[PDB]
Symmetry: D2
Subunit: 295 residues, 4 copies
Amino acid sequence: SAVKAARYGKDNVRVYKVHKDEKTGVQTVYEMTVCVLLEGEIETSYTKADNSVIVATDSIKNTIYITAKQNPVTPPELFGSILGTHFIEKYNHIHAAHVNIVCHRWTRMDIDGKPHPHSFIRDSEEKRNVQVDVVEGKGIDIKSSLSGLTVLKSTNSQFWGFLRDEYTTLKETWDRILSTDVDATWQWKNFSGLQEVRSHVPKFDATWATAREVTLKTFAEDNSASVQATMYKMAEQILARQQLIETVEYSLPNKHYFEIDLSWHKGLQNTGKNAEVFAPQSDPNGLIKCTVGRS
Amino acid sequence: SAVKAARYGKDNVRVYKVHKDEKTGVQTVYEMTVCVLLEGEIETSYTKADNSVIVATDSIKNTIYITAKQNPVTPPELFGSILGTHFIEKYNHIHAAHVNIVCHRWTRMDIDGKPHPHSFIRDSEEKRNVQVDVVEGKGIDIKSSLSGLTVLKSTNSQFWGFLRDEYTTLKETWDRILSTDVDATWQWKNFSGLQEVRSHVPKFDATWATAREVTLKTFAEDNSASVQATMYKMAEQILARQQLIETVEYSLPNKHYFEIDLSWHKGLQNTGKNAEVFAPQSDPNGLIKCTVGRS
Amino acid sequence: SAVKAARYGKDNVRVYKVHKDEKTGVQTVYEMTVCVLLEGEIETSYTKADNSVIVATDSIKNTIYITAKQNPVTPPELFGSILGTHFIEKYNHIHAAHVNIVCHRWTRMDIDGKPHPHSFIRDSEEKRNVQVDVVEGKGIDIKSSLSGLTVLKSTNSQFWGFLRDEYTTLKETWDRILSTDVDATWQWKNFSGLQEVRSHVPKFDATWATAREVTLKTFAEDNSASVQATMYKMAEQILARQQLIETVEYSLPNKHYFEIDLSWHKGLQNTGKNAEVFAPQSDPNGLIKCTVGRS
Amino acid sequence: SAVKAARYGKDNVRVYKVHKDEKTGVQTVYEMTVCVLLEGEIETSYTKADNSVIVATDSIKNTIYITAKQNPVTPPELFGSILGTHFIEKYNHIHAAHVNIVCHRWTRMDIDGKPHPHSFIRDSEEKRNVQVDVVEGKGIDIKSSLSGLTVLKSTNSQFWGFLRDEYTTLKETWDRILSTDVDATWQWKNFSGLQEVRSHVPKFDATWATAREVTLKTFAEDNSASVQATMYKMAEQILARQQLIETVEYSLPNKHYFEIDLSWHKGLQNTGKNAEVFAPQSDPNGLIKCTVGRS
Ligand SMILES: O=c1[nH]c(=O)c2nn[nH]c2[nH]1
Ligand SMILES: O=c1[nH]c(=O)c2nn[nH]c2[nH]1
Ligand SMILES: O=c1[nH]c(=O)c2nn[nH]c2[nH]1
Ligand SMILES: O=c1[nH]c(=O)c2nn[nH]c2[nH]1
Ligand code: NA
Ligand code: NA
Ligand code: NA
Ligand code: NA
């Protein structure tokens, strides 16, 4: 037997950082969960019990805190690139670092119409994520994403004209509820190294904001022919607005809300045009994916 | 042996209702999870296998949907009171109904600064809840609550002057992070029945809004001497603003964020006045409760 | 306003303890999650920002570890009683301690038919719990429980003869699946103090074992007329076997498995006597409770 | 823009099947959660709103139930292969099916030392999984796995001789707790189609049993030099015992249990050789992966 692939490191490292403005007294907080996995010439730790090649995962944890102390943690694309680069440069035998960051929302509170200087609220479990792969001699690959964005529209979704055979019971519809949890990922063109990532720093927050805005607007305004057709419209627009993105991937559950026939009870009308009360279904769910690139 | 207490019913009944305005085209959605448990002269189902006294839990589920079809579902205090009253009036041998409702957020989307007519976003997992106990001959007891409201302040929290003995290692502090998930419950004076609940309908949404606003403002503005002292200030204000509340209960975790000493690494300064990077702790947590009433 | 009730302390304190037998080399591990909440003359911490009355929750955490170091941690009824008693005796102004312990399973591994001296497996998320309330001058109240015991029987459950009215759609059945997650609690007679708890130490593990065995056997062997009737049989037997128990409470979900009519597809027969494939329902669920005491 | 990749289908389809032995009266239950995603010539549903190419996800759900009705559901490798093959053969334009199955434990109850004919217990949240990829003209790729197997050993784990630099604070140790949740996957050689999968049916359950046994025995008996070294020993043995496996992948968290220094309290000794009480850490955790193949 032989080691075909190996990676190891520290997961679930929770980090908070506060920035305090000297002049204004305004404080800004960042909170993330970080995972760092390393690859390189480490096979002998597995095959020969040779720990001399292991950078302890506890040390990786220390490094994350030290790096956060000495560098900005925003945008997360930059922080992940700094962190991954550190490992490949510091350790001769480590040749790849894989950094995953989940950013948690701490939104500044408005009290009496004024933004508060040091108080924050978690408005939703929506996350902003990055995956940064730093590979020695191959540059820096970054995938940025948003996840946990849960939306619902109560009309202006349709689904008809699908294949019908002996396995089909679903009725065609011209008016249904559409609800989903949005997972959207945009993959950046490969960067040559940290200097190039630094050169594009303003584009990261701007592209996240664009991706979010395009997702919300398209969802709200499309008279949707299917999840497939609506998601494609979203991806098309993001690619058009940021030339440094190579691909956009969406993964969308279709969280079903079923009509409830109440006609057995005193002829009560609650289906089709009379539908007011629905039963949300926890499972099963549709799951629709697509990756869109440039032609 | 004897049955000392018994209750039974249906839990986790998910319900969605849409209201469609005829003139404006604006749609409004409500989504809740409902539990209904009944009590009454039902001992023989347990002791003698006599099912004749059982209103099937499946029928309770049907009743929830039918009731939602025929009545407003907002405010939840009213809907719960209608639902509980139904069971005690419909069935001679049922003498108490216990209705718990969790309301999920579907907040109307703003697209290009305009509120969208039929698109919604789940902004946070904060819930608005009610517990309604309808007891034949004893009226209607309602407890209203908000839960899952997660906040953090990065300064203006202190904790010093506590008891110090041979079990104590905690250092006094004049500047710490305070973060919590707010669970706040206000208990209404007993209502004589459904007519009286109807008479107070406008107070329910107003008091929820007040409780939320008082919680947020007090948290943000108090230079907190402890969780205990800040929570008491919140409860005091709610009681002052709504005379029909008898008690206010708060239950607050203290979600710790620990300083990280980095001085072992090149004398890096990250404690006290130099603290920038902290380690959020998943567990353990402080848990502080109090119930405040009128003197 | 006035403080009507207050309690505070530390939740989610994870504790592991190992016992090493000197002669045999056999090791035994215990892992628990502990919560301790205190009450007493502490109102002024809430109303006057007087921290002098607060035993810091961090100190409560230290005390749990110290107590576990110096005392057996099994049975949990004894450990909880020691822990609660400590607080009321050590601090003049603390008059009640409320201790909740969840015990996690670490079952010794069998390797090649022999029990291993120091290796363990988590066989299921079933827990053994205690709630111990130590109240100065009122002794020690203990509630013991098991929870998270998930079972299913595929036949020998019936449900017919229930009330049928205009809200009822459920069909009577003489053969259904019954599946539940068992939550069973037995409440001990009040103990005068720690000496009395010590005197009954062997009864705690024995009664837990009995409660578990009675639950499993009754579930498996009863030709169940309803969840109500089967649960009552369980409680009756536990009360008969342990005279120091005052009440037994069961709380049982009815986790539904629905038939799937496949007759639309080539007349395939999958209902009633031909039912083989079912759809487990995540929600809603029945919820049936009862408390049984001595007549 | 162009569709680069697309797949869609139904997730979280819960399925239960019962087998009833005619002669013996013994019943056996199976419960699984199934996901099926399809690929093929479906781009136009995304780009042109052409639903004619969509097999509705609701129909995929129906197909799963029908397939379970007409075929054995065990071993899951066979059921997944039947299910995936159905889609590529039935629909001309569907060219790949991806089937994921999670099998839930329902272990027959022993009552009074005898196996019960129709009563079952969920003994642990350990799962047995398969991933089956059926690709038209490329055969059937199967990855089998076990997950959620949680173990702990209280001694006979060491970790010393790792790299030490200015980022390192971890002390070397010759005696520590090792606890993990095992995720192990074995990848089968490609099969040409369903006939070949059928020919190997007995090997599937046998190899699962072997993988489980090797994991448990190696974990219990290895005087572990690191997670890396122990996991490699496991994988080596599985590959040696089943020639039809090409690779074995392990993914293991290192769930830390920290010593608690209690010496500040009356010189209490609880570290090194005197360590009895430990603090389990919820996060962060080490994460160690490796894929082992044939040389
Ligand atoms: O938008 C949808 N896409 C689909 O593929 C599908 N299948 N069933 N319902 C559906 N809705
Ligand atoms: O606000 C606090 N209240 C308390 O009771 C406490 N105990 N430790 N830290 C604390 N902080
Ligand atoms: O055992 C049962 N008890 C009940 O109260 C009930 N109601 N619906 N189905 C049921 N099954
Ligand atoms: O077994 C281990 N492997 C590692 O890579 C490691 N790093 N810190 N502790 C560790 N333990
Ligand atoms: Na390197
Ligand atoms: Na009544
Ligand atoms: Na006392
Ligand atoms: Na095909």
